[PDB]
Amino acid sequence: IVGGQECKDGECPWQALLINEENEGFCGGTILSEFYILTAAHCLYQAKRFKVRVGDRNTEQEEGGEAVHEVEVVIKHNRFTKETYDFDIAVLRLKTPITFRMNVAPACLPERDWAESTLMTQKTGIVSGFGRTHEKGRQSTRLKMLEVPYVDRNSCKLSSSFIITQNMFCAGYDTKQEDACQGDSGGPHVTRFKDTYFVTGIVSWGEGCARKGKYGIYTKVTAFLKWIDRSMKT
Amino acid sequence: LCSLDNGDCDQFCHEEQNSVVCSCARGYTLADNGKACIPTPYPCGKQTLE
Ligand SMILES: O=C(Nc1ccc(-n2ccccc2=O)cn1)[C@H]1C[C@](O)(c2ccc(F)cc2F)CN1C(=O)Nc1ccc(Cl)cc1
Numbered sequence A: 001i002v003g004g005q006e007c008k009d010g011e012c013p014w015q016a017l018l019i020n021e022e023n024e025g026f027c028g029g030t031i032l033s034e035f036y037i038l039t040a041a042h043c044l045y046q047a048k049r050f051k052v053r054v055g056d057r058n059t060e061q062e063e064g065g066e067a068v069h070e071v072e073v074v075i076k077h078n079r080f081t082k083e084t085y086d087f088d089i090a091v092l093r094l095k096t097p098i099t100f101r102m103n104v105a106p107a108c109l110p111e112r113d114w115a116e117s118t119l120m121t122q123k124t125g126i127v128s129g130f131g132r133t134h135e136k137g138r139q140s141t142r143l144k145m146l147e148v149p150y151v152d153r154n155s156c157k158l159s160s161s162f163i164i165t166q167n168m169f170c171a172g173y174d175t176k177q178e179d180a181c182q183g184d185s186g187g188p189h190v191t192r193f194k195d196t197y198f199v200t201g202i203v204s205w206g207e208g209c210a211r212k213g214k215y216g217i218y219t220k221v222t223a224f225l226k227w228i229d230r231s232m233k234t
Numbered sequence B: 001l002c003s004l005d006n007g008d009c010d011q012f013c014h015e016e017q018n019s020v021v022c023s024c025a026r027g028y029t030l031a032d033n034g035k036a037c038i039p040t041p042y043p044c045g046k047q048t049l050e
């Protein structure tokens, strides 16, 4: 996350972190339930084997509230390709259930029509993660969050060098130096409604980070609500 | 209806028979007033205080 602010205690409890065999964070995730994590399909190519850490806000030190969970089943959308980055979505079934506590809780999955008319017509969403705090920088030690404006769909088709599909949406700023970045991919985009936070996006891709005339690109969760539900039951 | 301040619902709003029907995400129950969503601890979408 470029710019934004630190997640303070309890502010971003649905943030999950995918960690490699070196216990190093490479992608984000969203807690959906005690057994299920939402992430990006493209994160699944970034590590041979990986685990999920919940409850972390500062990776330098182990405070006590953190917990690591092994992955039982990986469910990657069968239409994802690196060529387009379309269908950039995966769901993980964990081997052991998450214990909800301070800094550990799920975000709500909304209903499709209500989400599109009520959440996505909001002024802003919130993106979070441990990714780089600048384009050329190192992975962040602290969990950060950033309010990102929703971006007019034509405005961001015009801005993109790659095709923006209907499974994507744009958020962030034209010139202001705030954005998600590499290492934040897979993580939460949530929208606040009456002090309740609903998952609306998965951090997907962007051209660099925080670039002038470029936006952050997110997987549209509302396009996959039925696929997510199916993945969580079958 | 749902176009007017979300039909006064806490969460989901649907218009059935030209009247508002509110509902809630998993782990919430619809209050007696048919509008508020009551957590059934650590309900989805709430920042954690303890
Ligand atoms: O993988 C990246 N970018 C990327 C990947 C794929 C595509 N892409 C999209 C559609 C079709 C094909 C395709 O390759 C575009 N950008 C990395 C390298 C990246 O482009 C990059 C460039 C120069 C740098 F010096 C450092 C970087 F990290 C930035 N990336 C990134 O994912 N940024 C990002 C992601 C999410 C959000 Cl919300 C905001 C920013």
Ligand SMILES: [Ca+2]
Pocket: A056, A057, A058, A059, A060, A061, A062, A063, A066
């Ligand atoms: Ca820690």
